[PDB]
Amino acid sequence: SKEDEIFRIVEEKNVRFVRLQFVDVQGIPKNVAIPVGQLEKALGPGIHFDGSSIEGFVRIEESDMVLRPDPDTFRVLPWSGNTAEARLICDIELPDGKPFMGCPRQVLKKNMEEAAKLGYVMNTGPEMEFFLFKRQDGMPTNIPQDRGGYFDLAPIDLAEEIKREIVLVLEEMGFEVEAAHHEVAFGQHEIDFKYDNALATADNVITLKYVAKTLALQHGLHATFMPKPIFGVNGSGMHTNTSLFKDGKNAFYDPDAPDQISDTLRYFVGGVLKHIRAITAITNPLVNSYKRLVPGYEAPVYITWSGPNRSSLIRVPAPRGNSTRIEIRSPDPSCNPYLAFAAILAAGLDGVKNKIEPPERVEKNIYKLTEEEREKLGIGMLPGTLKEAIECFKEDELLVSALGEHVSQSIINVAMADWDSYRTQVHQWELDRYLQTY
Amino acid sequence: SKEDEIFRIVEEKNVRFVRLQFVDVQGIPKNVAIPVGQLEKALGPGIHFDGSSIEGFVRIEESDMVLRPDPDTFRVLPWSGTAEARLICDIELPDGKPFMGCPRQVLKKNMEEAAKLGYVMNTGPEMEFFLFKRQDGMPTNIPQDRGGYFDLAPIDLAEEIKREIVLVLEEMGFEVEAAHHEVAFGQHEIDFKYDNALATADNVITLKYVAKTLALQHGLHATFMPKPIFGVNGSGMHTNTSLFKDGKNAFYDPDAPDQISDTLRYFVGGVLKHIRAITAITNPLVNSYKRLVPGYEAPVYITWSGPNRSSLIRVPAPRGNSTRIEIRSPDPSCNPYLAFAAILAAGLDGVKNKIEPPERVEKNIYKLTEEEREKLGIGMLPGTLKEAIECFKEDELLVSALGEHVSQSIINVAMADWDSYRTQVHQWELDRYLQTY
Amino acid sequence: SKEDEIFRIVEEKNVRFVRLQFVDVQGIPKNVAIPVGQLEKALGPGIHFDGSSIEGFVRIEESDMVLRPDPDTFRVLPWSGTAEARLICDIELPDGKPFMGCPRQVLKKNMEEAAKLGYVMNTGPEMEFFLFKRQDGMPTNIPQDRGGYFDLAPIDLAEEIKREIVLVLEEMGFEVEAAHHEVAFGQHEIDFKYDNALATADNVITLKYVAKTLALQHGLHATFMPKPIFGVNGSGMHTNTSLFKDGKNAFYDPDAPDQISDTLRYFVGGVLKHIRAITAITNPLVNSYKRLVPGYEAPVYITWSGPNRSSLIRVPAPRGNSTRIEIRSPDPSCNPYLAFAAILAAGLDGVKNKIEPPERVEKNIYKLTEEEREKLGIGMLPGTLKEAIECFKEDELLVSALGEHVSQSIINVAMADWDSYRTQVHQWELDRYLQTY
Ligand SMILES: [Mg+2]
Ligand SMILES: [Mg+2]
Ligand SMILES: [Mg+2]
């Protein structure tokens, strides 16, 4: 069985500790370290723990929970020197064996199972943008490690060595990396890995953030997936490439169709656009996410879909065949990948199941359009603030049902907690603008 | 004539310079210094100047304007040298036509419309302000002391400067009523007697001028910013208002319940009707809405009541020629000329059309639940500056009273501040997300 | 095939990453790092990427491009780790059509046109560059030493790093000819053997990459900026050029005077004809014209001569298969692909139409008077970057050879730099005028 190979690897690689990973609703990694002597117990009945101290999980009066590891996610952490360490991505179950409704990974699993009913397997291949910042007195800052730009090369790109270190580590963990390059903003970078099913890709996203932040710390740096850490430079975003597969073939490809795109592609897009306002509360979960998604500026805030036009929200790149896909450009890397993929799959399937026609394509540069011109074309915009998107998310009956009322309420609780604090704040901008004059 | 006494004062006090004061749409004082030899020219044909560089005035292609001083506003600045004086001015065009973008002219227009019905509006504002330290010649938001409400020295470290301000004000003709330390650190309040809206607005601009000037002489910075420090009280310009007709207080009616005339209730009904749009004038800054925060001890909930200090409109105890309402939503950063005009037009709309106000609310509105407020139908003010500007655009009455020119200037400056504020990355976001994400 | 040997090298040298190199219109190197597992995909269908964020490439609405590597350009970077390799790429569109904005494709096109007549252009540039100190991790313009021409240690403090660069270059297949300290402080020059224009341009981009990378490893900053220090020499990319037809040097003719063929003179006549417009390509920066200053020891005067090192075009002594002309006006900051293409098209226009060059000038052109230069009809290059861009707009031949797309990109970036440069208030102006005016 799978558990036999796990213990075979432990004896050979001399693994002495296993980390039992999972995420809260926010997507922040959590783990318990156990000696390898408890591994038999962890893979059997599971390791109990107190969930009342995890964000958006359970209450104090019913706090006992259980970690149910996923055997396939077993990897050895390469940065271990005598004394190795391994990790297991876990699901959360209740003491009675019932799956915990609030576990984000279980949510994606549920939505993937529903998609399997209809014969669809959603593949996702995200484009992770991130920043590398300096540390000052052991504390992270928002100072770029280099002042380079798009596709730049050393000596303008000062992070070639650490990016080479990150990619190598990932490959050692079974990743198939496709490309790595310096992004537009100062000290911004992008690592792209090969598409996979939603669950494996989500596990990979959480893993990549762990590896990136870890090695950056070893270099005296700080990696951050925050959407808009610096004002005046490009924000980091998570362009999510998506495609549906059915009967082993790309369900989005249809050679006998215009532009060689099937009606399934169009209906999937129609559903995603139909719910995009509510989805943004998931894919752009921070107050800071809307300082990148700002109306009226060079950002994918205008609800449109087009061909290879990189100013719309949903792009349809040139490749066809088994590479036919759609690129959703609104999400940013701070989102919970399990919940983001779940919300996109739910909306897209709602479009396929119900034959939701998408709007006309907009092959023009939407960024250079006038508000009057946008009104004539009926182009709407995404929520402007976090509170705006949460209100939109509350009303989407399909999304709340697809994510579960437990998860949905936790997302609303943490968001409105951040907002109620942010709206009361007095920022430096207000002093710099009014203090001398008034 | 008035001009003759002005020159009598000049020779006695040996005034050598005269400042020609006015304000842009934002309420910021503007002035030109002319030698006393040019005073005869100013009080006659006026002094020409360039209006293209004043906020919300005229374009570059038709920029020549004329300052027309109001002789009643002549005062000698008590900080001499080489004495100096000042004149508040109305802005006119070269052809003698009044410039309908001038805020002071706007108030004059709405008051003339009130005079058509025989009404004269009186106002008396409670001016809250902060006294902050200067660091390297630049102003800061550090309180000059760490005292509180009605505190006495040594806790109150600004007694000597408040004594100087009140003295200067009284020398300038003010009838000061009281001064005291306010709730927040280094916060204070000076109250002066009421007067007609035009007089009171001139007093408001003068008080800020006197307070800010003397604060500078003491190495401090007086600011009328609404919410300069997070976590402490904010500055609020409570505005007491009353209408007078045929010499008597139109808000008083001894034969009525609570001795409140129907003109009072109708006036309140109209103010509450337009209060969502008035807030763009009375609370014009982005920072204004860090004091007018929903769900906190702040006059955010649209209600009117008696002496209950938690409602938006308060009707204090005094009756007779002292009957008044107190509007507590404004803050000191508003343009007093525009704020009084917007309140006057809205209140007269209530009287003109007999707009019944909602039921009073004498309970503690701050301690009500969101569920309780919905049962009583209590609404809220705009939450942000954009929200209020959007409500101000749709108010056809207010835009017509203030004038399309002034209204457009207000919208332009507000959306300018907003488009800059909404794109900023603030420290709060880095403190909240940088370490974990 | 070539692809088979690439994978043979990968296994032996244990290469794990491959960089896909190219350049924007400005000549700045750009690359994408792909794991060696993706190399099979790159050499087949190619690697797609976004071209909207590359300078002077494509718009946002049609941004999907494809990198198509040239297998001949595969080299292993001698600074290993975890070995790394690189491939120079041509940019194509998703439909397989070549992107006519790609500078490397432009040179290819003009070379194909030269092949139509049986000509192959050869180039060998003399690369002058500076070695500067780093302060707080940022580059500076402080010379690493204070030495001069052909100076030896300890005066020359960059012997160890030049030894490293040449070693790396030779390991990358370069045939290095000589290296030495140049005139200015911390200035140096490395010369490598000539080759065809495409090969040599790849060598130029590689040399700057190797020089700048190793300089960083030693804590320095190598810069190919034309005039980074006022009062010392500037960096110049003398460009030796020759044409080959039927395997022999087309510029050599033993039966002719000075053993110079008519093809040589006609080629020179065409280059001089368009040299005012070529300068926008060969000297593309504002800073380029602080080295090309009229009235100083700099190749500014449009002339051609023999081995006289003061003319714009020099015909060195070697004949036979070494007959060449040396164009001394360019500087290292130019895009070598675009510079070689502009020179080729202009020279072929001279050969095609038999354009007679002006009389040679074998005297010291720098020591001539403005009066003397007018008698001989000697012209001058553009004085500023705007002057050269205006001359480049009117050159219908050059714009057609480089292509309307690349030409427009060049004009856009140049006028962008100029509109920013012309509005600046420089320190020189404050030093000259602030105290007295
Ligand atoms: Mg990107
Ligand atoms: Mg008070
Ligand atoms: Mg030389």
Residue numbers in the entry:
A (entry chain B): 3 to 84, 87 to 442
B (entry chain A), C (entry chain A): 3 to 83, 87 to 442
Paper text:
The enzyme from M. shengliensis was crystallized in the absence of ligands, and two different crystalline forms, referred to as MsGS-apo 1 and MsGS-apo 2, were analyzed.
Glutamine synthetases (GS) catalyze the ATP-dependent ammonium assimilation, the initial step of nitrogen acquisition that must be under tight control to fit cellular needs. The active sites are located at the interface of the N- and C- terminal domains of the adjacent subunit in the hexameric ring.
